[PDB]
Amino acid sequence: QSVSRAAITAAYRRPETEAVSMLLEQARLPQPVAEQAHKLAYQLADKLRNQKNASGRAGMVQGLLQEFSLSSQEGVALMCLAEALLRIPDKATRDALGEPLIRKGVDMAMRLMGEQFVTGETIAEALANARKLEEKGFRYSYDMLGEAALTAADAQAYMVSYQQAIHAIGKASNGRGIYEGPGISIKLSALHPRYSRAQYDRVMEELYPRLKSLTLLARQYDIGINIDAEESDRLEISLDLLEKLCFEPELAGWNGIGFVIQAYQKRCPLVIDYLIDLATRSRRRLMIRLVKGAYWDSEIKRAQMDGLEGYPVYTRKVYTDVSYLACAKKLLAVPNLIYPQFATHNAHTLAAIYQLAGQNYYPGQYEFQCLHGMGEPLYEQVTGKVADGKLNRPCRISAPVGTHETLLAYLVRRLLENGANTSFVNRIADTSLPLDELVADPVTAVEKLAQQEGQTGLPHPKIPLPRD
Amino acid sequence: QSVSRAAITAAYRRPETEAVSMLLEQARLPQPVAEQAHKLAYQLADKLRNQKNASGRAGMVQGLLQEFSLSSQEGVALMCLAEALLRIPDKATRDALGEPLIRKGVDMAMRLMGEQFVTGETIAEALANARKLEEKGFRYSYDMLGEAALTAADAQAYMVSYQQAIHAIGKASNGRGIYEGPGISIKLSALHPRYSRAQYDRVMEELYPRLKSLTLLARQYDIGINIDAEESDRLEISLDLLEKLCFEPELAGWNGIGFVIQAYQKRCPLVIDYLIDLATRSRRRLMIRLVKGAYWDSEIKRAQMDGLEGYPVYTRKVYTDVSYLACAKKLLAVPNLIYPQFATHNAHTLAAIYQLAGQNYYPGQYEFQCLHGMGEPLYEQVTGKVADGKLNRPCRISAPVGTHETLLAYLVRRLLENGANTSFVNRIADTSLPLDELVADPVTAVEKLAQQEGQTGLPHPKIPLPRD
Numbered sequence: 001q002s003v004s005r006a007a008i009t010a011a012y013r014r015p016e017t018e019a020v021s022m023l024l025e026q027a028r029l030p031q032p033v034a035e036q037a038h039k040l041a042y043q044l045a046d047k048l049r050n051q052k053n054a055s056g057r058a059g060m061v062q063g064l065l066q067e068f069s070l071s072s073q074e075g076v077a078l079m080c081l082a083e084a085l086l087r088i089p090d091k092a093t094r095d096a097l098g099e100p101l102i103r104k105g106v107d108m109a110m111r112l113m114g115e116q117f118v119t120g121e122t123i124a125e126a127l128a129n130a131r132k133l134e135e136k137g138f139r140y141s142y143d144m145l146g147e148a149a150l151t152a153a154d155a156q157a158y159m160v161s162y163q164q165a166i167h168a169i170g171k172a173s174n175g176r177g178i179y180e181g182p183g184i185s186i187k188l189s190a191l192h193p194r195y196s197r198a199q200y201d202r203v204m205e206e207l208y209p210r211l212k213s214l215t216l217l218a219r220q221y222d223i224g225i226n227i228d229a230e231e232s233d234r235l236e237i238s239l240d241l242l243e244k245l246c247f248e249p250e251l252a253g254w255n256g257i258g259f260v261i262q263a264y265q266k267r268c269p270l271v272i273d274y275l276i277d278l279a280t281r282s283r284r285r286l287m288i289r290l291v292k293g294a295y296w297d298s299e300i301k302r303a304q305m306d307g308l309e310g311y312p313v314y315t316r317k318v319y320t321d322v323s324y325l326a327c328a329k330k331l332l333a334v335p336n337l338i339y340p341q342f343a344t345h346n347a348h349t350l351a352a353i354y355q356l357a358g359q360n361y362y363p364g365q366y367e368f369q370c371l372h373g374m375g376e377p378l379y380e381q382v383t384g385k386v387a388d389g390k391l392n393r394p395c396r397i398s399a400p401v402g403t404h405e406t407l408l409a410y411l412v413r414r415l416l417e418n419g420a421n422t423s424f425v426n427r428i429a430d431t432s433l434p435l436d437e438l439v440a441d442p443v444t445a446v447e448k449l450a451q452q453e454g455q456t457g458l459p460h461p462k463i464p465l466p467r468d
Numbered sequence: 469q470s471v472s473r474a475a476i477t478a479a480y481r482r483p484e485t486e487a488v489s490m491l492l493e494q495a496r497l498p499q500p501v502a503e504q505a506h507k508l509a510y511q512l513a514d515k516l517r518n519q520k521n522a523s524g525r526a527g528m529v530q531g532l533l534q535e536f537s538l539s540s541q542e543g544v545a546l547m548c549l550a551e552a553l554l555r556i557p558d559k560a561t562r563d564a565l566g567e568p569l570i571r572k573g574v575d576m577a578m579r580l581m582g583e584q585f586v587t588g589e590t591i592a593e594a595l596a597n598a599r600k601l602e603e604k605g606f607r608y609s610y611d612m613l614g615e616a617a618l619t620a621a622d623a624q625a626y627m628v629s630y631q632q633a634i635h636a637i638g639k640a641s642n643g644r645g646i647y648e649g650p651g652i653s654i655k656l657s658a659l660h661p662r663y664s665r666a667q668y669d670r671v672m673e674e675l676y677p678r679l680k681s682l683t684l685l686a687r688q689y690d691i692g693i694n695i696d697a698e699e700s701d702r703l704e705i706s707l708d709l710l711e712k713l714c715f716e717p718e719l720a721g722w723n724g725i726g727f728v729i730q731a732y733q734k735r736c737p738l739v740i741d742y743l744i745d746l747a748t749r750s751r752r753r754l755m756i757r758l759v760k761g762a763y764w765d766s767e768i769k770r771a772q773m774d775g776l777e778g779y780p781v782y783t784r785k786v787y788t789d790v791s792y793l794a795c796a797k798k799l800l801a802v803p804n805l806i807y808p809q810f811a812t813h814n815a816h817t818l819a820a821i822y823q824l825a826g827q828n829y830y831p832g833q834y835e836f837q838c839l840h841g842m843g844e845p846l847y848e849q850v851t852g853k854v855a856d857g858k859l860n861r862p863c864r865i866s867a868p869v870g871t872h873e874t875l876l877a878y879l880v881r882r883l884l885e886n887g888a889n890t891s892f893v894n895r896i897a898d899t900s901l902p903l904d905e906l907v908a909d910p911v912t913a914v915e916k917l918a919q920q921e922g923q924t925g926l927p928h929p930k931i932p933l934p935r936d
C-alpha cells in the first residue's frame with residue numbers, strides 16, 4: 001500500500017484512549033474562537049428551540065403551578081375551564097358566572113413516519129419541490145432511496161434510475177454548475193448485487209464501469225455526483241473505486257466528484273490525508289462531505305458479533321464530535337484541494353465550523369448540508385441575506401427520492417438519529433435541558449470525563465470490547 | 469337625512485326573508501363564473517387542507533382499520549408496536565423477533581391561546597416581523613389592541629399610542645404609499661371614554677378632533693388609516709364621523725382614508741350606496757374593507773335583550789355569505805370611487821371575488837386581507853409570482869399590536885371565530901367534511917333551504933325574533 005493507504009489500514013480499530021487523545025489538540029478551538037462559537041451556537045439553538053416561545057410558555061405554566069400548588073393534571077383541568085370561560089362572548093356574563101397484521105402495521109408505520117423525510121416519490125416530483133428553497137439560496141442533492149441491491153436485476157434497476165435522475169437533475173440545473181446547482185448522490189451498494197460481501201475483482205469488473213458511466217454523465221451536465229458512505233467494512237473498496245475514477249482521462253480538469261467521509265470512524269483523519277494526496281496526484285479539487293455517520297447502532301452490533309480487537313467507530317458520542325472538529329480543521333486547511341461540505345443539524349458543530357473557516361468567506365470556500373425534514377428550520381437562520389438576520393452561508397439539502405418500496409432502511413436510520421438521547425435534534429426538543437449544556441464544547445466535555453475517570457478517551461462504560 | 473342615509477336607517481332590522489330575497493340575484497354568480505370560482509375554491513381548499521397529506525394519511529389509516537377489522541385504540545396500539553419494531557437497527561433481528569385561581573387561570577389561558585394572533589407587543593417589535601412576508605408581496609395593517617376605553621385617561625393613552633404607532637409605521641413605510649406600504653387601523657371606541665353610550669355632541673366635540681389629528685398625521689406619512697367597524701349600534705355615529713373627515717380641506721385629494729363595512733349587517737348594501745355617494749361628493753377614492761363581522765355572538769345576545777322588532781345581523785351564516793358576495797359586486801363596479809379590500813379566510817369567498825373582479829387585474833384594483841395567525845397559509849397560495857404557482861394578488865395582513873393588558877376582547881372574538889362549527893377555518897380542519905361541501909356556493913345553499921322550508925331567507929330555526 002501507499003504510505004497514506006497503509007496509515008488508514010493501521011488505524012482501523014485503534015484503541016479509543018489512543019485515538020481520542022491524539023485528536024484532542026487538533027479539535028481544540030483557540031479560546032477566542034471557542035467563545036465566538038459558543039455565542040453563535042447559543043443564539044442559533046435559542047432561536048430554534050424558542051421560535052414559538054416554547055420555553056417561555058413552559059415557564060409561565062410552572063409559575064401558575066406554584067402560585068396555586070397544583071399538579072399537572074390540575075393545571076390542565078384549570079386551563080380547560082379557563083378556555084370554556086373565554087368562549088363566553090360577553091365579559092359581564094363571564095364575570096357573573098396474526099403476523100400479517102404486524103407486517104402490515106410495520107409497513108404502514110414506515111410510510112407514515114417516513115413521509116416527512118422524503119422529498120419526492122419520483123425525481124420529477126422532487127425537483128418540483130425545489131424552487132421554493134432554491135430561491136432562498138438553498139441547494140439540493142438528490143439521493144435516490146434504494147440500497148443493498150440483492151440481485152442483478154435489482155442493481156440494474158437502480159442504475160437505470162440513477163441515469164434517468166441525472167438527466168432530469170442536469171436539465172433542471174441548466175448549466176448552474178457543481179456549486180450553485182443541484183447534484184446527485186449515489187450508494188455503491190445499489191449498483192452491485194450483494195455489495196456487502198463482494199470481492200475486489202468483481203466490483204472493479206462490474207461496479208466500476210457503472211460508477212464511471214454515471215460520473216461521465218454528471219460531467220456532461222456539469223452537476224456534482226457524490227458517493228455516499230455506507231458500512232465501515234466497505235470503506236476500503238470505496239477508496240479503490242474513487243482512486244480509479246479520479247484518473248479517468250475524460251474527467252480531467254473537472255471537480256464535480258464528491259465523496260462522503262464519516263467522522264465516527266477512527267480512520268477518518270487518515271482518510272483525509274489520503275484524499276489530500278489523491279487530489280494532488282489527480283490534479284483536482286474533491287468535493288468532500290464531512291458527516292458524523294448514519295450506521296452507528298449497526299456498527300456496534302456488527303463489531304460485537306465479529307469478536308475483533310475493537311470497534312471501527314467511537315463508542316461515546318462526544319468523541320465523534322471531537323473527531324468531526326479535528327477533521328473539519330484538516331479539510332479547511334487545503335481549499336485548493338478540497339471543497340468541504342459540512343453536514344450537520346447540530347448548532348454547536350455548525351457554529352464551530354463557521355468560526356474555524358475564518359475571516360473572508362467566499363461562496364466556493366465551503367458549504368453546510370442537512371437532511372430534508374430535519375435541517376431546514378436551523379438553516380433558515382443560516383442561508384439568506386445578512387440584512388434579513390442570516391449568516392449568508394449556503395446549505396445543500398439532501399433530498400431522498402423514491403417510493404415506499406425503497407424507504408425502509410433510510411427511515412430506520414432516521415428513527416435512530418432522531419430518537420437517540422445523545423442526538424442534538426433530540427436534546428434541543430427538551431426544554432428541560434439548558435441551552436449552555438446543549439451547545440457545550442465537546443473538547444471540554446472530553447477533558448471533563450478524563451478528569452473524572454482517570455484517563456482520556458475511555459470507551460462507553462456500557463460498551464465493552466467485543467472480546468469482553 | 470339624505471336619501472342614502474335614510475335608506476340605511478330604514479334597513480336597520482329588516483325581516484330576514486325580505487333582506488335575503490333581495491340580495492340573492494345580486495349575489496348569484498353567472499354559471500360560467502360560478503364554475504371557475506368552484507374549481508379555484510376547491511384547489512385552494514385542497515392544497516390548504518392537504519399540504520402535509522392529512523386526508524391521504526387519514527385514509528391509509530381507515531384502510532388498515534378494515535384489512536384487520538380493528539378499533540381506533542387497536543390501530544393505535546399496533547402503530548406503537550410497529551414504531552418500536554422500526555427502532556430495531558438490524559432488519560434480520562427485527563424479522564426474527566378559590567376565584568383567584570380561576571381569575572389567574574383565565575388570564576393565563578388568554579395569553580397562551582392569544583400569542584398566535586398577536587404580531588408584536590409593541591409597534592417596533594411588530595414592524596420588525598414584517599420584512600419576512602413583505603418581501604413576498606404581503607402588506608400590513610397594524611391594529612393596536614385596546615378598545616372600549618372606560619375613562620378619559622384610558623382614551624388619552626390609546627390616542628398617544630396611535631400617534632406613536634403612526635410615526636413608527638410612517639417611518640418604516642418610507643414613502644411606499646397607501647397601497648404598497650403598511651397602514652394603521654383604529655377603533656373609535658378607544659378614542660372616546662364610554663363610546664358605547666356616547667352622545668352625538670360629545671363625540672363630535674371630543675372624538676372627532678382626535679380622529680382628524682391622526683388622519684392628518686397618516687397623510688403626512690402617506691400611509692393608509694382605516695376605521696374598524698365595531699358593534700352595530702355605533703354604525704350611525706361612525707358614518708357621521710367619516711362624513712366630516714372626508715371634507716377636511718387638509719385631506720383634499722388624498723385617498724388614504726379607510727373604512728370597514730360588515731356584511732353580516734342588513735344595512736351593509738345601503739351603507740355602500742351611501743359610501744359611493746360620499747366618495748363622489750368629497751372627490752376621493754375610499755379604501756373600503758369588506759368583512760363579514762367579528763361580533764355576531766354578542767349582536768344576537770344584545771338584540772334578544774333589547775326586545776326590538778328584529779336583528780341588525782343575519783341569523784344564518786350562509787346569509788352573511790350571500791350578503792358578502794352581493795356587496796363585493798357593488799364595490800367592484802366603482803373602481804374610481806372605491807378601493808375594495810376583501811377580508812376573508814374562506815377559500816370560496818376568495819375564489820368568488822377573484823372571478824367577480826374580472827379580467828385584466830391591475831394592482832390598484834383591489835386587494836385581499838387576512839388576520840395574523842389565521843390567513844397566512846391560505847394566502848401563501850395567493851400572494852406571489854404566477855411562475856411559483858400563485859395567483860399574484862396582494863394580501864394585507866391585519867397585525868395586532870399590544871401587551872396582555874389589551875388582548876382579552878380580541879382573543880375572545882378569535883376563539884368564537886375559530887371555534888364556530890359554521891366557520892370555514894373550523895370546517896376545513898375536518899377531514900370528514902368533503903371539499904365540495906366546504907366550498908359550496910352560498911346562493912345555491914340558500915335556494916336549497918328555501919325549497920325545503922317553503923320560503924327564502926327564513927331565520928335560523930334556533931334564533932326566533934327577540935319578541936318571541
Ligand SMILES: Cc1cc2nc3c(=O)[nH]c(=O)nc-3n(C[C@H](O)[C@H](O)[C@H](O)COP(=O)(O)OP(=O)(O)OC[C@@H]3O[C@@H](n4cnc5c(N)ncnc54)[C@H](O)[C@@H]3O)c2cc1C
Pocket residue numbers: 227228229230260262264289291292293294295296313314315316317318319320343344345346349369370371396397398417420422423424425460
Ligand atoms: C447532507 C447529509 C449527508 C449525509 N451523508 C451520510 C452518509 O453518506 N453516510 C453516513 O454514514 N452518514 C451520512 N450523513 C450523516 C447522518 O446521516 C447523520 O445525519 C449524522 O451523523 C448526524 O450528525 P449531526 O451533527 O447532525 O447530529 P449530532 O446529534 O451532533 O451527532 C449525531 C451522531 O453522533 C453519532 N453517535 C451517536 N452515538 C454515538 C456514540 N455513542 N458513539 C460515537 N458516536 C455516536 C452518530 O454518527 C450520530 O448520527 C449525512 C448527513 C447529512 C446531513
Ligand SMILES: Cc1cc2nc3c(=O)[nH]c(=O)nc-3n(C[C@H](O)[C@H](O)[C@H](O)COP(=O)(O)OP(=O)(O)OC[C@@H]3O[C@@H](n4cnc5c(N)ncnc54)[C@H](O)[C@@H]3O)c2cc1C
Pocket residue numbers: 695696697698728730732757759760761762763764781782783784785786787788811812813814817837838839864865866885888890891892893928
Ligand atoms: C383583515 C380583517 C379585518 C377585519 N376587520 C373587521 C372589523 O373592523 N370589524 C368586524 O366586525 N369584523 C372585522 N373583520 C372580520 C372578522 O374578524 C372575521 O375574521 C370574519 O367575519 C370572518 O369571515 P371569513 O369569510 O374569514 O370566515 P367565514 O367562516 O366564511 O364566515 C365567518 C362568519 O360569518 C358570520 N356568522 C357566523 N355565524 C353566523 C350566523 N349564524 N348568521 C349570520 N352570520 C354568521 C360572521 O360574521 C363570522 O365571522 C375583519 C377581518 C379581517 C380578515
Ligand SMILES: O=C(O)[C@@H]1CCCO1
Pocket residue numbers: 143228229294398410413414
Ligand atoms: O442513508 C443515510 O442515512 C445517509 C444520509 C444521507 C445519505 O447517507
Ligand SMILES: O=C(O)[C@@H]1CCCO1
Pocket residue numbers: 611696697762866878881882
Ligand atoms: O377586533 C376584531 O376582532 C376585528 C378584526 C380586526 C379588526 O376588527
